[PDB]
Ligand binder design. Structure first.
Ligand code: ZN
Ligand code: ZN
Lengths: 469, 465
């Protein structure tokens, strides 16, 4: 039949155009099943091309299965089933076209899920990456140890021992790439019918994870000392998920008395565990870093989970999990797990820590965040006056703000979105399902220049002030 | 009670030395509950330190709950419950100290789970990372999209549109960081009671993944055309997990005949899906890259899953997943998922692809893997002669070798280990556990200079004792 070739410079190769055309004619039944195609030399002369082109085109059709060959004379069109001719679905629904990529500027964000990128020593970080690459060539092994590179885990071990008081062997550590991955892995090491208990309000993300994992999740109310031991002994769970260093999102710090109560509870009966979601303990502005709950544990019932998400690059995402011996044995009986963190990044982190650049970085950021947090609880107090109520300790990268307004939380979040302001509600942290109505205020990715404007935008959103045309 | 202080500091600061000592005395019950604590001035005069030091030390104790304060002053020791002192567990069991330095040298590897680190343009990778850094350094905090950065998803979309024929929108792509992570999310997007079906034999890791998710998994044995459309109709699953480009680990290529049958099968009933696991389709040595199964799908029932772990560095691990519209909707109804790939890693990959360095790398590696595979085949025919049977298409980074021997597979792996040869058996890829002994031969990490000895280290393990 008719085959037109394109002699263009940047067109597909000759042999490519040939089998593409033949694929089309076979799929459209123009070339009947089991019908003989011309010989290589015959079709070549007919298209005035090299026989090696027709051969390469045929071999392509042979390998894919459009043609089959018989030992003597000719190739034949393989018999292909006709398409089901069902209802063809439309292409790209408009509501899924929500991705309207445009411009992140000038948006002002009060998000708690990021970090400042302006004060990050990117030059020192790249020096650590180059140094690690020239010493660990060729990237040590090929991939990585399932728990992560040992030297990297041993580095993090020394760090959290000096800064958190966490006592563990590198063998106990597992990274990483977010707590969401480590949490999933942990739920499979814990008993299948283990009852989990979370703080209300708390981390909605872990709640969704535990619910989608088919695990029963209890909700434990908070008091002035944090997670209520009274409700824990009442509902009687198996595994606790707490944030004692800085409660998410209430902001309260669990005192040593309440910690000992929990530790004693976990020692009362076997198969009881406490999960430590430590995510911003390295940032305290009135006091030093508080020794984590795991540091006081003597029964190895505490699972410590740390992260570098808020401390390093915003998108880096590297977490770690410290497993007690009994859970480590459960992990080693697997052997099919793969490391989710880039081995090249791990080596960089090891060098960033060992060179002392990390702790040096934390010190500078802690002062920067300290200064950014007020001015912030000063513009809010200047704008809202007594209409704003600020809850939460003087630490971390977020605090709660309650407002006196008739508008709902949704109406506030809608106006802010229309004023190019990224803020998040407080009702989303309600696990079991007020009105304050409260908002979570982050200042990690917040620029110091956009502080006064952000508060002014926030005010209009709270009281629904219309724009003057 | 005395408190010794180092005033040279660092060491620790004075206020740090103070509250640490006070913590110890409160926990050791030496300072009784509700006992009066010396005033900030009193303790300062007594220790010859600044009041600001004692104040900083007291504040630390107040925040941690070691002390409590009264409005009319002063500070008192908080009533703390004693520890249980019940049963203390051991410290670091010797059998769990497996983390010893294992030397992979001088070991000849026939492992399939790798890619050559020595042939990767690491200098070119770093140059791309630096350009992507300086381009988005001021906007790194704003590029943390759950599905992955839009510009990155678009670049991968355009790539697989040309190399795989995959037709999709950037909206549908989901990065990433390993197919394992993507599979986990996929099981959550798919119906909770969906019956999965893998190939037999197949990728054992995805089997364990699905089983641990509490999902029902049926095994479909292969014929000459790959995954059996016959058993698919008989065992009637809801989701198919297939490797049509290059079957793992049998190595057969699913012909367009079988591909159409599977596609029509998915359209027979609503809520039927097919997971296409593409992992090495960019390495065909006889023909061009065979277009993906998703490229022929007209009913949006195929989930295409790609990865760079085999393309680039195995230590990198960047994957991607193209969702049909129905599944993307289920994803958007969640809104709590987070990206697992580094923002700087994504932007580096995008730069690596758009600069042409990726296509340049693939082209060089494809020829290198081609020449190495044939030399390995030639060496396998030198030894063994006809007693060896090489199975699998002329593509990818692995093939199967059947051996005509009366020695068990386990005993072959024993001697091979004894001859410092890293090799895996085909019995490990059986999902539901069942001669002649068969081995999987990966040549991605294998050096050309160790091919002859490697084959010589083989044979030996199969026949010699
Ligand atoms: Zn126990
Ligand atoms: Zn359907």
């Amino acid at each position: 039949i008719t085959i037109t070739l394109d002699r263009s410079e940047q067109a597909d190769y000759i042999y490519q155009q040939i089998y593409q055309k033949l694929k089309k004619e076979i799929l459209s039944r123009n070339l009947l099943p089991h019908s003989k195609v011309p010989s290589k030399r015959e079709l070549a002369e007919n298209l005035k091309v090299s026989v090696n082109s027709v051969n390469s085109a045929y071999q392509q059709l042979l390998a894919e299965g459009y043609l089959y060959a018989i030992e003597r004379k000719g190739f034949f069109v393989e018999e292909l089933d006709m398409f089901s001719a069902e209802e063809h679905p439309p292409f790209a629904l408009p509501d899924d076209l929500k991705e309207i990529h445009i411009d992140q500027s000038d948006w002002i964000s009060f998000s708690h899920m990021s970090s400042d990128t302006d004060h990050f020593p990117i030059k020192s970080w790249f020096r650590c990456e180059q140094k690690a690459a020239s010493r660990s060539y060729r990237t040590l092994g090929d991939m990585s140890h399932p728990q992560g590179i040992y030297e990297v885990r041993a580095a993090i071990t020394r760090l959290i021992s000096l800064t958190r008081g966490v006592k563990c062997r590198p063998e106990q550590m597992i990274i990483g790439a977010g707590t969401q991955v480590l949490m999933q892995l942990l739920t499979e090491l814990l008993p299948k019918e283990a009852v989990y208990a979370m703080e209300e309000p708390g981390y909605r993300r872990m709640y969704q994870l535990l619910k989608n994992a088919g695990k029963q999740v209890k909700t434990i109310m908070l008091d002035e000392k944090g997670m209520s031991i009274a409700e824990i002994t009442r509902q009687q769970p198996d595994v606790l998920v707490t944030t004692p260093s800085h409660q998410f999102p209430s902001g309260t710090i669990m005192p040593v008395s309440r910690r000992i109560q929990l530790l004693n509870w976990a020692a009362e009966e076997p198969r009881r565990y406490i999960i430590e979601d430590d995510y911003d303990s390295e940032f305290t502005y009135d006091v030093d870093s508080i020794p984590a709950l795991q540091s006081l544990d003597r029964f190895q019932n505490v699972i410590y989970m740390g992260t570098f998400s808020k401390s390093l690059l915003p998108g880096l995402r590297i977490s770690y999990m410290v497993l007690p011996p009994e859970l480590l044995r459960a992990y080693k009986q697997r052997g099919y797990d793969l490391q989710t963190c880039s081995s090249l990044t791990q080596l960089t982190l090891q060098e960033f820590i060992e060179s002392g650049e990390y702790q040096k970085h934390i010190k500078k950021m802690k002062q920067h965040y300290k200064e950014k947090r007020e001015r912030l609880i000063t513009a809010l107090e200047a704008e809202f006056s007594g209409e704003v109520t600020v809850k939460g300790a003087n630490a971390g990268l977020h605090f709660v703000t309650e407002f006196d307004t008739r508008r709902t939380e949704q109406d506030i979040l809608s106006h802010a979105a229309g004023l190019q302001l990224e803020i998040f509600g407080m009702s989303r942290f309600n696990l079991k399902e007020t009105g304050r109505p409260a908002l979570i205020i982050g200042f990690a990715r917040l620029k110091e220049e956009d502080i006064q404007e952000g508060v002014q935008r926030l005010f209009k959103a709270v009281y629904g002030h219309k724009k003057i045309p």
